[PDB]
C-alpha cells in the first residue's frame, strides 16, 4: 500500500555486481554463491564483481559446518531512465547447484521502473547433526547459489545482496582460507572534485 | 560339523576399543631442518592420508569401521639439549580451500597443540575430527577433507648438530567425542576462540622493552593489503562490543637458557614506552623455571570498567584508542650465555562469562600485529 | 508498500507455459491441472507447454489419494516493452471442473506492467476419510484446474506455476503411471555462443 | 510491496456487471444489492447485468433471516489501453439504503491502470436475536447495497463481485422465491472458431 | 542408497508414490530393512554376502569381509531372507538423491553391496537371480525440503 | 600436555579376542575342477602361508602376538545341486619331509575335517596347531613348518556346469 511497514535490523552488504557498460544490450545474468562468497557472470560478459568483508560474510566462508536460517535482501539499482520507457525486469533464481537438472528452490520475478528490493530467506540444513558443509563431497552436499538475471542490462545497473544471520544460527569447524583481500565500499558518491 | 552363518559374530558395528597398542593405527615421521627461525611448514597433509603407508594392529579396523566412537590421540616424540629452544605445533582443521594461509593464527582456531621439545620431551593430546557430531568414520575425514598441519612457530635459539625428526603415534583412544558449536547467545557461560595474539620478541640487553596487544580482536589479524581470520575470531566479530573473563596461554619457545622476567597487565594505549610505573597497575609477574613451559593468565571482570568495542578502525592513533590492551613488559632484563631471543607465544583461548553487545555492522580489516 | 516482506520457503517450479510466437495478437489462455500435471491451451493456439519433475510434482500424479492444503505461486514474465505502452492483464481462474456450469473457486485479476507474481492456496479435501482421488468417478470427485488468461499475448510472455506442499499434507495409494519423460529447466539464459 | 501475500479461500462469483458499449463516454455507475442479488445501473445506461447461482448466492435470497459477517472481493477488469493513457478510477460505496440521507458505510477509491481487486467485509447484524431480515419493514431493517462507479466507462470494462461466507454465519427462515433462471459463467474466452 | 527421484529408464524415470514421496527430503537416515528373495531353482546354489560400503571400492577388492557384513546361504527350500542394517552402519544422514552424471568415485552416499563369497554353481545351466526390495525404514529421519533433481541413476 | 610413556597400554601380551569379525585373519580361495574322481590335491600349502595376501581386522594382530591362546576356526563355503555328490577334506599336520604321500590315509591322522558339499553347504571346525602345548604363535607354525592340506576324496557323482 501507500504506507510502509517498519523494516528493521542490520543487513550488512556482502556481494554486489554491476551490469556491463555500454553498448552491451543483450540479456545477461550473474550467479551469487551466498555461502562461500563467490560471484560469477553468465558468459564473458563484463560485470563489476565485488566481495565485501562484513563480520557476517567472513564467518560464512571461514566456518566449515553451518546450520540455521539466513535472511536476505536483494536490492536493484538502475541508471536514470524516463520512467515511461522502462522495460527492465529481474528474474532471481535461488538454487542448490547449477547442474541443469536440479530445480529451483524459490523463484522470483519483478519489474520495478527505477529500482526495488526483495527480502526472502532460505534454510541451511545439513546431514551431519543438522549441519551442511558448504558443497562438501561427503553426503554430496550443496550450497546456495542465487542467480539473478536482467532483461535490459542498460536500465538495470546493479544487484546488491544483503544478508543477516537469524539468531538460530550455529556453526562449528574452521576452514583454512587464504588472506582476505581488503575490499571497501564503493557507494559513496563517485566524487572526485 | 556344519552351521548356519547368517547369524554369526560378523555384523559387528562397535567402535575400536582396547590398549594403546591395538589402538595405534598410524605412525608418521616428520622432519625438522637444522635451522628454522619461524613460520616454517614442517608437514601439511590431509588427515585421512596419515594412514597411507601404516599397518598396525588398529590400522585395518580403523578404515573398516563405519562409525568410530573415540577421539584421536596424537603423540609426538622429540627431545633436544637443555641449551636449546624451539616451538612446534600440530593443528587440525575441518577443511581448506585454495592457497590458504599456513600462518599460526590461521590454524590454531580449532583443535591444536603447541610445545617446546627443549623442555618437554614428548607432547600429545586428543581431538575430535567431527567438530559438530559425536561420531566420525575413516571415510568421513577423507571426504570432508579434514586437513591437519605441523608448523614451527619459533626457530631454534641454537642449532642442533644434525637435522632431527619427531614421530607421531596416532591412536583411537577410549574417550567420548564431544561437539563444539558456536551460538549467538549474547550471554555465554564460556566461549572458546583460540585466537592467537602474537609472537612476542625480546632482544637481549638492558633495552627498555614493552609490547601491546589489541583487546579489540575483531575482524581478524593483520597482513599486507588483506586480513586473514579463522572461524572463531571471525565469528566473535559478530558483536559490536563485548566483555568477560579473559584466559590466556603464554608459552616459552626459547631455550631455557634465555632467562628473562616478564610482567603482564591490562592497561590502555596512551601509555608511554618510558613509563616505568606499570607496576602500580594490577599485574602478574612471570618467571620461567628451567623446564616450565606454559603459564596461564586470567584477567577477571574487575580489570575492565565496562565492555569495549570488538574491533576499532585501523587508522586510529595509538592515543585515541579507548579499548584495553594486554601488556607485556620486561620487569628486569632478558639475558643469556648464548646469542638468542626470548620469544613468547600468547594465545587467547577463551572468554568465561562472555557478554556480546548488539550486532556489529562491520569494518574492513584490522590493526596489524 | 516500498518495503517487501520476507517471503521464504521452497517452491519448486512445476508447470510453465509460454504464449504463442508473433504475429498471434488475439486474447488467449491456458489451463493447468494442478493435481495431475496436465497443461492444455484454449484452442489450437501455439503455446510452449512444459511439465517439470520436482520431487513434489511427482508425488502428485503418483499418489492416488491426497488430503491437505497446497501453496501456490504463479509468476508472469513478459517480453520487454516500453512501460507506458503496457495494456496486458491476467485473469487467473481457479476451478474444480471446466464443465461450463461449475463456478470459479477463487478469482484473480492483475495488470502488472512488466511482470508480477501472486500466491494463493487451495484445500484438497475429499469424501473418503478426507481424501479426494484426483477426478475419480467414485463420488464424482474433481481436481483443481487453474486457468490463466492473457489480454495481450505479445506483452505477456509466460505463466510459471510454483507449488509447495503444506506440512498437513497426507497421501496414500499409488497410481501406476507410464515412465516420466526427462524434462529439464529451460530458464537459464537461452545462451549459445 | 513486490511480494504477494497468500490469499486463499473459496470466493465464488455472484454478481458481475459490464460497462455500456461505445460510444458512451460519460461517467456511470451501478448498484449491487449484496443480500438479495439484484443489480441496477444508474440511469438507462446499457450495462451487462448477470446474476449467478453459486451455492452461496442462493442461500442469500432464499434465507429470510441472516446473521454474521460476509467477505467480499471486488474485481475490476478493463479493456486493453496504453498504460500511460489510463485516467480511470473506481469509487465503491457500501451503504444500507439509497435514500439520499443515509450516509456511506465504508468508502473506497482506487485508480489501477489496467485492473485491480479490493477485499472488504461487512457485518449483517439484526434486531431479532441478532438477525436482519433483508429490507423487512419490521424494524425498518435495511440490506447492503454496494454502489460502484467508473470515471471512464471506456477503460473500465467490468465490476465483478465475489463473496464468501464467514464461518460465524447463521440463518433461519425461508422466503418463497420464483424459479431461478439458469445463469452460467460467460468468462471463458468469448471463443467462436 | 540414494533412492531419490525414482528408478532408471531410457530418457525417463518411472516412480511409484512412496519412493516418489521420500524424495521430498534432501537427506535422510534410519534403520534399513530389506527382503531378499531367491528366484532361481534351488539347484543353483551360491553364497552371497551383503554389507554397506561406499562407491570408490574396486571390483577386485577382496577384503570386503573386513567390513561389517551378513553372509547369506539358501537351504534347498528357504525363500526369503531379511536384512537389517542398524543406525551404526551409517556415520551420518546422506543425500536422498544425487546427480546422475556423478562419477562412481565422487559418490559420497552409502551403497548396499552384494558380493559372491565363494562361487555360484549348479548341475544345470542357469542363473542365480536375487530380488532385493527395501521394504521400510525404522526410525526414519527426513532432513530439510529437497529442491529436486531430474531423473536418477539407472539400476 | 606431556606425559611419561614407559608405562602405557603398550606392553600388551594378551591373545586376540573379540567377534568372528575382528578374529578373521585369513580368507583363502580354493578351486575345484569340473571333474575329479578321487585323490586330487585341491590345494596344499604351509599353514603360516595362508596369511600372505590377507589383510583383515585380525590379520595384523595375528602375526604380532607372541603367544596366541585360541584355536583356529577354518570355515569352507560351497554348495552344489541336490543331484550331485562329492567329498572334500581339510587336514592339518605338524610337519612334512621329502616327497610325501598326499593320500587321504596319510593326512587325516592329526586334526582333519571331511564333508560333502552336496548335502551340507558349509563346513568348519577348530584345531590346535601346537599338538603338545596350549599356546602357539604366528612365527611358530611358520618355523615348525606346519602344513595343511585340501584333497578330494571321491569324485563328483555328476559334473557341475
PDB file of C-alpha atoms in Angstrom, chain E residues 14-112:
ATOM      1  CA  UNK E  14       9.500 -44.196 -13.528  1.00  0.00           C
ATOM      2  CA  UNK E  15       8.473 -43.933  -9.873  1.00  0.00           C
ATOM      3  CA  UNK E  16       5.787 -45.185  -7.538  1.00  0.00           C
ATOM      4  CA  UNK E  17       4.126 -42.966  -4.961  1.00  0.00           C
ATOM      5  CA  UNK E  18       6.243 -43.970  -1.895  1.00  0.00           C
ATOM      6  CA  UNK E  19       9.684 -43.642  -3.438  1.00  0.00           C
ATOM      7  CA  UNK E  20       8.468 -40.531  -5.228  1.00  0.00           C
ATOM      8  CA  UNK E  21       7.384 -39.181  -1.805  1.00  0.00           C
ATOM      9  CA  UNK E  22      10.516 -39.808   0.252  1.00  0.00           C
ATOM     10  CA  UNK E  23      12.168 -37.738  -2.477  1.00  0.00           C
ATOM     11  CA  UNK E  24      10.534 -34.863  -0.601  1.00  0.00           C
ATOM     12  CA  UNK E  25      13.549 -34.587   1.687  1.00  0.00           C
ATOM     13  CA  UNK E  26      17.154 -33.618   0.946  1.00  0.00           C
ATOM     14  CA  UNK E  27      18.963 -36.033   3.197  1.00  0.00           C
ATOM     15  CA  UNK E  28      17.767 -38.883   5.394  1.00  0.00           C
ATOM     16  CA  UNK E  29      18.651 -41.902   7.519  1.00  0.00           C
ATOM     17  CA  UNK E  30      17.309 -44.663   9.731  1.00  0.00           C
ATOM     18  CA  UNK E  31      17.339 -48.410  10.170  1.00  0.00           C
ATOM     19  CA  UNK E  32      17.182 -50.129   6.792  1.00  0.00           C
ATOM     20  CA  UNK E  33      15.089 -53.245   6.261  1.00  0.00           C
ATOM     21  CA  UNK E  34      15.429 -55.479   3.204  1.00  0.00           C
ATOM     22  CA  UNK E  35      13.682 -58.551   1.805  1.00  0.00           C
ATOM     23  CA  UNK E  36      15.974 -60.620  -0.425  1.00  0.00           C
ATOM     24  CA  UNK E  37      14.158 -63.379  -2.338  1.00  0.00           C
ATOM     25  CA  UNK E  38      15.592 -66.355  -4.273  1.00  0.00           C
ATOM     26  CA  UNK E  39      14.037 -66.604  -7.745  1.00  0.00           C
ATOM     27  CA  UNK E  40      16.329 -69.303  -9.170  1.00  0.00           C
ATOM     28  CA  UNK E  41      15.922 -73.064  -8.925  1.00  0.00           C
ATOM     29  CA  UNK E  42      17.112 -74.337  -5.561  1.00  0.00           C
ATOM     30  CA  UNK E  43      19.548 -76.253  -7.754  1.00  0.00           C
ATOM     31  CA  UNK E  44      21.517 -73.105  -8.417  1.00  0.00           C
ATOM     32  CA  UNK E  45      23.482 -72.893  -5.173  1.00  0.00           C
ATOM     33  CA  UNK E  46      25.661 -69.882  -4.322  1.00  0.00           C
ATOM     34  CA  UNK E  47      26.715 -67.968  -1.236  1.00  0.00           C
ATOM     35  CA  UNK E  48      26.230 -64.212  -1.306  1.00  0.00           C
ATOM     36  CA  UNK E  49      27.459 -61.706   1.233  1.00  0.00           C
ATOM     37  CA  UNK E  50      25.978 -58.268   1.905  1.00  0.00           C
ATOM     38  CA  UNK E  51      27.204 -55.096   3.532  1.00  0.00           C
ATOM     39  CA  UNK E  52      27.091 -51.325   3.398  1.00  0.00           C
ATOM     40  CA  UNK E  53      30.113 -49.658   1.846  1.00  0.00           C
ATOM     41  CA  UNK E  54      30.914 -46.739  -0.404  1.00  0.00           C
ATOM     42  CA  UNK E  55      31.398 -46.439  -4.177  1.00  0.00           C
ATOM     43  CA  UNK E  56      35.150 -45.937  -4.720  1.00  0.00           C
ATOM     44  CA  UNK E  57      35.548 -49.641  -3.847  1.00  0.00           C
ATOM     45  CA  UNK E  58      37.386 -51.671  -6.502  1.00  0.00           C
ATOM     46  CA  UNK E  59      35.784 -54.776  -8.101  1.00  0.00           C
ATOM     47  CA  UNK E  60      38.954 -56.710  -7.371  1.00  0.00           C
ATOM     48  CA  UNK E  61      38.982 -55.575  -3.758  1.00  0.00           C
ATOM     49  CA  UNK E  62      38.541 -58.899  -1.959  1.00  0.00           C
ATOM     50  CA  UNK E  63      38.719 -57.727   1.681  1.00  0.00           C
ATOM     51  CA  UNK E  64      35.084 -56.746   1.808  1.00  0.00           C
ATOM     52  CA  UNK E  65      34.894 -59.343   4.572  1.00  0.00           C
ATOM     53  CA  UNK E  66      36.686 -56.891   6.915  1.00  0.00           C
ATOM     54  CA  UNK E  67      33.684 -54.527   6.800  1.00  0.00           C
ATOM     55  CA  UNK E  68      30.669 -55.433   8.933  1.00  0.00           C
ATOM     56  CA  UNK E  69      28.564 -57.854   6.871  1.00  0.00           C
ATOM     57  CA  UNK E  70      25.955 -60.590   6.699  1.00  0.00           C
ATOM     58  CA  UNK E  71      26.562 -63.883   4.901  1.00  0.00           C
ATOM     59  CA  UNK E  72      23.598 -65.436   3.057  1.00  0.00           C
ATOM     60  CA  UNK E  73      23.166 -69.086   2.067  1.00  0.00           C
ATOM     61  CA  UNK E  74      19.901 -70.671   0.915  1.00  0.00           C
ATOM     62  CA  UNK E  75      18.589 -74.030   2.088  1.00  0.00           C
ATOM     63  CA  UNK E  76      17.036 -76.214  -0.606  1.00  0.00           C
ATOM     64  CA  UNK E  77      13.692 -74.588   0.288  1.00  0.00           C
ATOM     65  CA  UNK E  78      14.278 -71.293   2.188  1.00  0.00           C
ATOM     66  CA  UNK E  79      12.919 -68.492   0.018  1.00  0.00           C
ATOM     67  CA  UNK E  80      13.157 -65.267   1.935  1.00  0.00           C
ATOM     68  CA  UNK E  81      15.917 -63.692   3.999  1.00  0.00           C
ATOM     69  CA  UNK E  82      15.580 -60.375   5.860  1.00  0.00           C
ATOM     70  CA  UNK E  83      18.494 -57.902   6.012  1.00  0.00           C
ATOM     71  CA  UNK E  84      18.624 -55.352   8.759  1.00  0.00           C
ATOM     72  CA  UNK E  85      21.193 -52.565   8.830  1.00  0.00           C
ATOM     73  CA  UNK E  86      21.103 -50.599  12.088  1.00  0.00           C
ATOM     74  CA  UNK E  87      21.986 -46.942  12.524  1.00  0.00           C
ATOM     75  CA  UNK E  88      25.598 -47.929  13.367  1.00  0.00           C
ATOM     76  CA  UNK E  89      26.384 -48.645   9.731  1.00  0.00           C
ATOM     77  CA  UNK E  90      25.993 -45.004   8.726  1.00  0.00           C
ATOM     78  CA  UNK E  91      28.031 -42.191  10.313  1.00  0.00           C
ATOM     79  CA  UNK E  92      25.534 -39.516   9.305  1.00  0.00           C
ATOM     80  CA  UNK E  93      22.487 -38.950   7.121  1.00  0.00           C
ATOM     81  CA  UNK E  94      23.022 -38.888   3.352  1.00  0.00           C
ATOM     82  CA  UNK E  95      21.550 -37.229   0.236  1.00  0.00           C
ATOM     83  CA  UNK E  96      18.198 -38.734  -0.823  1.00  0.00           C
ATOM     84  CA  UNK E  97      19.105 -38.380  -4.480  1.00  0.00           C
ATOM     85  CA  UNK E  98      22.376 -37.459  -6.140  1.00  0.00           C
ATOM     86  CA  UNK E  99      23.012 -36.167  -9.666  1.00  0.00           C
ATOM     87  CA  UNK E 100      23.075 -38.906 -12.392  1.00  0.00           C
ATOM     88  CA  UNK E 101      26.275 -37.602 -14.045  1.00  0.00           C
ATOM     89  CA  UNK E 102      28.181 -38.327 -10.827  1.00  0.00           C
ATOM     90  CA  UNK E 103      31.292 -40.488 -11.195  1.00  0.00           C
ATOM     91  CA  UNK E 104      31.230 -43.684  -9.141  1.00  0.00           C
ATOM     92  CA  UNK E 105      34.166 -42.467  -7.028  1.00  0.00           C
ATOM     93  CA  UNK E 106      32.872 -38.970  -6.426  1.00  0.00           C
ATOM     94  CA  UNK E 107      29.783 -40.537  -4.853  1.00  0.00           C
ATOM     95  CA  UNK E 108      29.590 -39.917  -1.123  1.00  0.00           C
ATOM     96  CA  UNK E 109      26.488 -41.886  -0.278  1.00  0.00           C
ATOM     97  CA  UNK E 110      26.416 -45.462   1.022  1.00  0.00           C
ATOM     98  CA  UNK E 111      25.649 -48.489  -1.120  1.00  0.00           C
ATOM     99  CA  UNK E 112      24.132 -51.841  -0.379  1.00  0.00           C
TER     100      UNK E 112
END
